[PDB]
Amino acid sequence: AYLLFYTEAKVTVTVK
Amino acid sequence: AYLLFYTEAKVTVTVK
Amino acid sequence: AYLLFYTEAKVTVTVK
Amino acid sequence: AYLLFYTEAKVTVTVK
Amino acid sequence: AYLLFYTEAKVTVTVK
Amino acid sequence: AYLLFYTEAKVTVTVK
Amino acid sequence: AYLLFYTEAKVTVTVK
Amino acid sequence: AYLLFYTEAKVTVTVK
Ligand code: NA
Ligand code: NA
């Protein structure tokens, strides 16, 4: 799986 | 799932 | 300095 | 400053 | 598992 | 689980 | 400088 | 500046 960084500042870290 | 930062400094990095 | 997580999910990672 | 992620997967992590 | 970084700058973060 | 840092510098980031 | 993980669980992420 | 990941497994995190 990847660690993904969704970003605006703020970031959301996801495991996909 | 998210990586969540539970924080006091120190932090717990939780996989949820 | 240390990395300061301001958590709301989303987080801001500050260099404090 | 804060950690600024530039996301494309690949990411560039910077200190802004 | 552990976090495996593939570095090129850009990096891919994976869970191995 | 949480991210467990085994630090020696170098670190191993385990998903515990 | 390094990012250093001072660790107990919780961790302090230090910029040195 | 960048956060850089030198990697062997172990990783070294640098601020450049
Ligand atoms: Na890309
Ligand atoms: Na590249």
Name the neighbours of A, counting chains with at least 3 Cβ pairs within 8 A: B, C, D, E
Determination technique for this PDB entry? X-ray
Residues of G in contact with H4 (CB under 8 A): none
Cα gap E12→A10, rounded to integer Å: 20
How are beta strands G11-15 and G2-7 bridged, if at all? antiparallel
Which amino acid would we find at residue D2? Y
> What would the DSSP string read from start to end of chain D?
-BEEEEE--EEEEEE-
Number of cross-chain residue pairs from E and H with Cβ atoms under 8 Å apart: 15
Structure tokens at B1: 């799932």
Q: Are A5 and E11 in contact (CB under 8 A)?
A: no
Q: Are C16 and C1 in contact (CB under 8 A)?
A: yes
H-run or E-run covering C8 = none
Distances in whole angstroms, Cα of residue E1 to Cα of each of A6, C12, E6, E15, H9 = 23, 26, 15, 6, 10
Q: Are G6 and B11 in contact (CB under 8 A)?
A: no
Cα gap A10→A7, rounded to integer Å: 6
